[PDB]
């Protein structure tokens, strides 16, 4: 559902700043709600915050996109830190969409197909039906690879992701810098046009006309050149806006899925820390229960009942933690899936990069050789 | 005589700074001294100062190139303000050479063909033989155009030259700026290569290999891209050094002949100010001598002899100033000649500009399309 | 235990980069290990990583300082991104120390008092004794304020902390910028000294001495001024290094405790999400068990035993989750404590700021008025 | 006659640019025209160009101020390159005024006391009465010092002036840079005020009020600090505008008299080049006339009359050139006078510099120590 979020509209512009109302333009192919012709919904940045928090509460250990930068920032006045917000926002929701469990979620579509305001929804909020997977499900192969190799597998990814996140950030930064470079270049290029026009006009005043005529030939060649520079600068700017504005998402989506897996491994490490403590209790109880086999020799109902309660609560504990451990690792793999899709995504990124650079260079070469005449 | 001045050598480098000894490499076609195979002479920046001052003293109202910036500047320590000095110096002397009267001058060739030091020359300095043209020469048409149109003609050039000097300076400045731009670009391009190499290396650590192999395909594509960027940056730098270093003189020579005509019109205005005062005396004496025709009625030998001395000295004065006025205007025209050569020089400048930009763009397009594969 | 970590030493410097060995200089007042005279221990950045991870595993919902930026960064070659690492590292450990539970922890002191390498420690790692607080402890007032006002209380802090984190970051950024400003200023100030010396030396060459002597008075006044500028620039640089280098931590510590509470509320929200799901199960089971009171009318041992297992496991569940909920909120308050210490810390920050600015301005005023003479 | 030229007015502002009409505000103490109460005259930049050219034509080898930068520049659109023009213009005319011969000139006062337009003046232009000093005047000591020491004296100044011109230019540049520095500083200072206000407002939201009250004390201290920064930034800006705007001329006047003596030595070298050629003819005729003393032995009226004409015209030539040589050197000295006034001018410059820096530092110290409370 490649949906677009453009024409963000707060209450009308002034000194102040308000939290814009974003038109969620449901360009729809997913049949959760049957694919509409189009059905816009007005929703806010606060609405998308509610959205993400609810996603986080319902679906743990699943891919989750970033947020747009904060609205309670120091000074978020001008339109830049709102345009970035809308482009990011589009990327964020649409990323939610390509992801499987979210595209199938109930919460998302209700967030999509709704015409009233947030409060009426709050009446039927009722996310109590939408919470943690407490159900035991039988893995076909209860031992596929979840610790034989996958443990070290994503243990290595845990660090490689921060490394590669810095890397890819620097890379798309470099592309943005190339773009601002070329925009400065077209600036001074039009300045150059101004100069060559003034120079054409001050060639006769400096080079006699009524005596020599070739000057007219040459300061008409310079008119050829001012027109060349006009066209060259225009197509520079065209490359800037079209090419780079539509190239940047092709890069940024990788960054966002990367830091989404960052968030994921953070949540995972700090919650599977519970299984860490539980395995430490595993060894602790192994030890205390092997020392327990003194036969319980003294006739003591107190010791009997106390350590019976101990072992029984610990037994239901170990079974529930094993249930939870497998139920976690499975979702880890479910996320590894679309991460291996991001794999091919980097391919798409670099190939589009080279292609559009080639288009730009081709037009520029054609312009140059055209000028040489 | 396209002579080159490279390998400027002061006493050896240290904290201090000395006035380098410039190897004047007489790549010679002018037969003043018969065209040598090559004959280097060691000469200093001070030597070229002596040169220019002597030229100025001997030949007034003739094209004269600039000097290199000052050696008694505030801080002229590092090699930049000496390399600019040597390139400028080459331009300055070689410009002296293409100019007719200088190429025919005696002073210049002696400055060229000499093997001793400056002092022995100072012994035979003897520039008393080389001074102002005091001789009357008969203009064929004593009225060609020297005031009917040429007066206003170069009166207009007097201002157009400062205008066009600023213009052309800005233009060649813009080219230098384009060059420094592209050098910064190749800087960050090699940084980009570093990044993509690190990214290739952290793709497997983040994208499983023993499971998925396509990652090897893609991070070998990125090796293709790092090699592309290596070649692209190398040829960027090649364009920088070769193209722009050998393009800049093609521009700067126009600037130097322009400010040479600037110097010329300065000297001319401030010395023909003498003819200005002389024409004011012309009208003053016209008036006083028409009032003089009272017949000199009183019998007075004092008044007779005094106003006779007046009229006779004023008569030799008016004839000598007319001699000088025509003898000046003629040299004005002699300079207008090579200025009308600079006319075609701007043509050469812009055409070479476009051509070498086209070469660069062509190589870059070939690199891009080669990469797309 | 205001301990210092200076003279970070990797294997010797070269092209490469290694993970320095940090001398933990136990300037000790805490008697966990009795206050030593001093006892340095060599430990690495990797060692401090092991440290922090272990802290995180053992003590949840407690103040925890940041890490230094990553060692697997893109290009961390030069010494800047290692000096920042050592200053940060000192701040990080020493912050661990002022915090109560950490200062009392067993893990930390062993990390401190140890002379062998990390591996021998790994033999006696034995952090199984050091894990999650599973014990029930009786809050004196089991209802102090943990939801009547404290819920909204830190709910508001949840957002105010990101706001104030941006703010305080900008503020200490501004101070660093002021410092770099003044360093650039002392740069051009010494350039100014160079200029005025050259100007003194070229005053006589331009202002006749053998005629006029007052020039000696004035170019000795300028010697007074060059000496003034020498002293002024020196004390500028002194203010830079001393004042700002020792002022910056006074600011940064607030930023680090702020983002420590950031990390805390992150962990807390995403783990108390478990209590969120548990309270949703609370309402769900309230509902299903009120619907359950059909008397269990049909004679069915299956339904009887199944819903008996349901209610019993849910009952032990609700008691364990209430135990955990209170056991969490208590640690929340324990952290609120030192946060209310950071309160006065901002006071210390601003007062030291103003004071050292005043010292600098005072010295500068004294220098100026001293110069006026 | 410290006259001021403010409220430059072209035809009203638009896209275009016109040559403003400058109100010459005759704050008059010189009685050439008796000191008026005040008498404004409207005059243009073109009018001042006519002025300077006329001065140059009438008075050679006398101090002459610069022009304002060119009006036919490439792009002189915005008001900066007109405000600099008006400040420069004021400096230029007022410098003309402090100079003796100009203050006594007839041309200047007519340029001052005039109410019609430039054309009516052009009717009575009549500068034929105002031209070169052709009169012989008897130097009391015909040998004061004009070559015994003054020759080398200003020969040395010829180069020292370009050196010191670069120096003093760099110096006043450095002051302008200090000013722009402090303006950027007050910019970020007011940004800092914005930050500390937002920080005060987000201290309670982050630091509990209903529990802890000291936060009110501290975020009222920060109100003290925001007011401090308000006042500090305001007085920073006051120092900027008042101090530096009124300090800069105190520096620039030295630069302008310096490059005025630059122009002077240029004119002098290139016109006394005539006396150079005349002294070369002096030695040439000494030689040819000593060789002439063959007695004129052959009976030849042709040779007799020809070399008699030679010697007689050369004799009147040598007497007229000696007249001119002394008449030049005298004006050289007349200019050396006010140059030795510029001597004390540099004193005034540096002393005012130090004083106003001291005022600024004093106010800033008072503000700081006031804040410490």
Closest residue in chain C to residue A272, using alpha carbons only: C57
Residues with Cβ within 8 Å of residue D95, at least 6 apart in sequence: D65, D253, D256, D257, D260
Q: Do B60 and D271 touch (CB under 8 A)?
A: no
Q: Do A74 and C283 touch (CB under 8 A)?
A: no
**Which residues of D are less than 8 Å from C177 in CB distance?**
188
**Which residues of A are less than 8 Å from B170 in CB distance?**
195
Q: Do C188 and D203 touch (CB under 8 A)?
A: no
Three-state SS at D207: coil
Q: Do C350 and D207 touch (CB under 8 A)?
A: no
Element at B263 (helix H, strand E): helix B245-292
Q: Do B202 and A346 touch (CB under 8 A)?
A: no
Contact between B180 and B210 under an 8 Å Cβ cutoff? The reply is: no
**Which residues of A are less than 8 Å from B172 in CB distance?**
none
Domain boundaries, chain A: 4-132, 176-293+309-372
Q: How was this structure determined?
A: cryo-EM
Contact between B174 and A192 under an 8 Å Cβ cutoff? The reply is: yes
Chain B residues contacting C, CB < 8 Å?
A: 74-75, 194-195, 198
**Which residues of B are less than 8 Å from A168 in CB distance?**
199
CA distance B159 to D72: 8
Strands A4-9 and A21-25: antiparallel
CA distance A127 to B249: 75
Q: Which residues pair with D6 in a beta bridge?
A: D23
> According to the 3-state scheme, what is the secondary structure of chain A?
CCCEEEEEECCCCCCCCCCCEEEEECCCCCCCCCCCCCCEEEEEHHHHHHHHHHHHHHCCCCCCCCCCCCCCCCCCCCCHHHHHHHHHHHHHHHHHHHCHHHHHCHHHHHHHCCCCCHHHHHHCCCHHHCCCCCCCCCCCCCCCCCCCCHHHHHHHHHHHHHHHHHHHHHHHHHHHHHHHHHHHHHHHHHHHHHHHHHHHHHCCCCCCCCCCCHHHHHHHHHHHHHHHHHHHHHHHHHHHHHHHHHHHHHHHHHHHHHHHHHHHHHHHHHHHHHHHHHHHHHHHHHHHHHHHCCCCCCCCHHHHHHHHHHHHHHHHHHHHHHHHHHHHHHHHHHHHHHHHHHHHHHHHHHHHHHHHHHHHHHHHHHHHHHHHC
C contact test, residue of B70, B198, B199 with most C CBs within 10 A: B198
The full DSSP string for B98-158 is HSHHHHH-HHHHHHHS--S-HHHHHHT--GGGS---------SSS-SSTTTTHHHHHHHHH
Q: Which CATH architecture has domain C4-133?
A: 2-Layer Sandwich (3.30)
**Which residues of B are less than 8 Å from D131 in CB distance?**
276-277, 280-281
Resolution in A: 4.2
For residue A131, give how far its alpha carbon lies from the nearest alpha carbon of chain C (Å).
Answer: 6
Three-state SS at D5: strand
Three-state SS at C220: helix
For residue B15, give how far its alpha carbon lies from the nearest alpha carbon of chain C (Å).
Answer: 15
Distances B33 to B89, B182, D230, D310 between C-alpha atoms, Å: 21, 44, 77, 36
Could you tell me if residue C35 is left (phi over 0), alpha (psi between -120 and 50 degrees) or otherwise beta? beta
The answer to whether C44 is a known ligand-binding residue is: yes
Subunits adjacent to chain C (3 or more Cβ pairs under 8 Å) = A, B, D
Tally the C-alpha atoms within 13 A of residue C230's C-alpha that lie toward its C-beta: 9
Tokens of A234: 């225009």
**Which residues of D are less than 8 Å from B271 in CB distance?**
270-271
- DSSP 8-state secondary structure symbol assigned to residue B67: P
Three-state SS at C22: strand
* From B74, B75, B198, residue closest to C74, measured CB to CB: B198
CATH fold for the domain made of B176-291+307-368: Substrate Binding Domain Of Dnak; Chain:A; Domain 2 (1.20.1270)
Subunits adjacent to chain A (3 or more Cβ pairs under 8 Å) = B, C, D
**Which residues of C are less than 8 Å from D174 in CB distance?**
188, 191-192, 195
For residue C199, give how far its alpha carbon lies from the nearest alpha carbon of chain A (Å).
Answer: 38
**Which residues of D are less than 8 Å from C167 in CB distance?**
195, 198-199, 202
Subunits adjacent to chain D (3 or more Cβ pairs under 8 Å) = A, B, C
Closest residue in chain C to residue B201, using alpha carbons only: C74
Q: Which residues of A60-74 are buried (b: 16+ CB within 10 A; e: fewer)?
A: bbbbbbbbbeebebb
CA distance D216 to C361: 29
CA distance A182 to A233: 10
Could you tell me if residue C213 is left (phi over 0), alpha (psi between -120 and 50 degrees) or otherwise beta? alpha
Closest residue in chain C to residue D371, using alpha carbons only: C354
Chain A residues contacting D, CB < 8 Å?
A: 74-75, 194-195, 198
Q: Do C192 and D171 touch (CB under 8 A)?
A: yes
Distances A331 to A335, B204, D323 between C-alpha atoms, Å: 6, 22, 108
* From C74, C194, C198, residue closest to B195, measured CB to CB: C74
Closest residue in chain C to residue D364, using alpha carbons only: C361
CA distance C205 to C225: 20
For residue B219, give how far its alpha carbon lies from the nearest alpha carbon of chain A (Å).
Answer: 9
Task: Give the class (CATH, top level) of B1-122.
Answer: alpha beta
For residue C82, give how far its alpha carbon lies from the nearest alpha carbon of chain D (Å).
Answer: 29
Q: Do A162 and C70 touch (CB under 8 A)?
A: yes
* From D160, D192, D225, residue closest to C206, measured CB to CB: D160
Q: Do A73 and C163 touch (CB under 8 A)?
A: yes
CA distance D216 to C20: 45
Q: Which residue has the tokens 């270049």?
A: A185
Tokens of D45: 């930049």
The long-range contacts involving B118-124, CB below 8 angstroms and separated by at least 24 positions, are B118/B44, B118/B46, B118/B47, B118/B50
Contact between B41 and B118 under an 8 Å Cβ cutoff? The reply is: no
Read off φ and ψ for residue C264, nearest 5 degrees: -65, -50
Give binding residues of D as ranges. Answer: 44, 46, 70, 85
Q: Do D267 and B270 touch (CB under 8 A)?
A: yes
* From D74, D75, D195, residue closest to A74, measured CB to CB: D195
CA distance C110 to C26: 12
Q: Do B222 and A343 touch (CB under 8 A)?
A: no
Burial class (CB in 10 A: 0-12, 13-18, 19+), D164: buried
CATH (residue range D176-296+308-372): 1.20.1270
Q: Which residue has the tokens 């510029």?
A: D342
* From D74, D75, D198, residue closest to A74, measured CB to CB: D198
D contact test, residue of A75, A188, A200 with most D CBs within 10 A: A75
Contact between C1 and C94 under an 8 Å Cβ cutoff? The reply is: yes
Residues with Cβ within 8 Å of residue A313, at least 6 apart in sequence: C316
CATH fold for the domain made of A4-132: PX Domain (3.30.1520)
Could you tell me if residue C151 is left (phi over 0), alpha (psi between -120 and 50 degrees) or otherwise beta? alpha
D contact test, residue of B19, B280, B321 with most D CBs within 10 A: B280
Contact between D91 and D249 under an 8 Å Cβ cutoff? The reply is: yes
The answer to whether A39 is a known ligand-binding residue is: no
Chain C residues contacting B, CB < 8 Å?
A: 74-75, 194-195, 198
**Which residues of A are less than 8 Å from D75 in CB distance?**
194
Three-state SS at C38: coil
For residue B196, give how far its alpha carbon lies from the nearest alpha carbon of chain D (Å).
Answer: 38
Distances B219 to A157, A342, A358, B213, D163 between C-alpha atoms, Å: 17, 14, 21, 10, 60
| Domain over D1-125 is classified CATH 3.20.20.150 | no
CA distance C253 to C257: 6
Question: The sheet that has D21-25: what strands, in order across it?
Answer: D4-9, D21-25, D40-44
Q: Which residues pair with C40 in a beta bridge?
A: C25
Three-state SS at B25: strand
Residues with Cβ within 8 Å of residue B269, at least 6 apart in sequence: B158
**Which residues of D are less than 8 Å from A198 in CB distance?**
74
Q: Do B358 and A368 touch (CB under 8 A)?
A: yes
What is the total residue count of chain C? Answer: 373
CA distance D357 to D350: 11
């Amino acid at each position: 559902a490649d949906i677009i979020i453009i024409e963000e509209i707060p209450e009308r512009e002034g000194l102040l700043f308000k939290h814009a109302n974003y038109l969620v333009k449901h360009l729809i192919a997913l049949p959760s709600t049957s694919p509409s012709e189009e059905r816009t919904v007005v929703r806010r940045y606060s609405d998308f915050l509610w959205l993400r928090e609810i996603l986080l509460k319902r679906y743990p250990f699943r891919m989750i996109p970033e947020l747009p930068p904060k609205r309670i920032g120091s000074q978020n006045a001008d339109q830049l830190f709102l345009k970035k917000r809308r482009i990011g926002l589009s990327r964020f929701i649409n990323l939610v969409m390509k992801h499987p469990k979210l595209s199938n979620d109930d919460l998302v579509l209700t967030f999509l197909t709704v015409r009233t305001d947030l409060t009426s929804w709050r009446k039927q909020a009722t996310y109590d039906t939408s919470n943690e997977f407490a159900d035991k499900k039988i893995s076909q192969e209860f031992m596929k690879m979840w610790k034989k190799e996958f443990a070290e597998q994503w243990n290595q990814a845990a660090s490689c992701i921060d490394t590669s996140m810095e890397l890819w950030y620097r890379i798309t930064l470099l592309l943005e810098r190339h773009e601002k470079r070329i925009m400065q270049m077209v600036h001074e290029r039009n300045f150059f046009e101004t100069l060559v026009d003034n120079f054409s006009e001050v060639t006769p005043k400096l080079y006699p006309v009524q005596q020599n005529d070739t000057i007219l030939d040459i300061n008409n060649n310079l008119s050829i050149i001012k027109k060349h520079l006009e066209t060259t600068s225009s197509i520079c700017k065209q490359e800037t806006e079209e090419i780079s504005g539509t190239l940047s998402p092709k890069f940024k989506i990788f960054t966002d899925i990367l830091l989404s897996l960052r968030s994921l491994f953070e949540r995972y490490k700090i919650m599977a820390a519970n299984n860490v403590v539980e395995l430490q209790r595993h060894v602790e109880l192994n030890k205390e229960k092997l020392e327990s086999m003194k036969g319980k020799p003294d006739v003591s109902g107190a010791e009997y009942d106390r350590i019976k309660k101990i072992i029984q609560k610990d037994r239901r504990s170990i079974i529930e933690q094993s249930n939870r451990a497998w139920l976690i690792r499975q979702c880890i793999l479910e996320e590894f899936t679309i991460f291996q899709e991001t794999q091919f995504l980097i391919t798409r990124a670099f190939q589009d990069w080279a292609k559009l650079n080639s288009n730009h260079a081709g037009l520029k070469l054609n312009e140059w050789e055209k000028l040489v005449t």
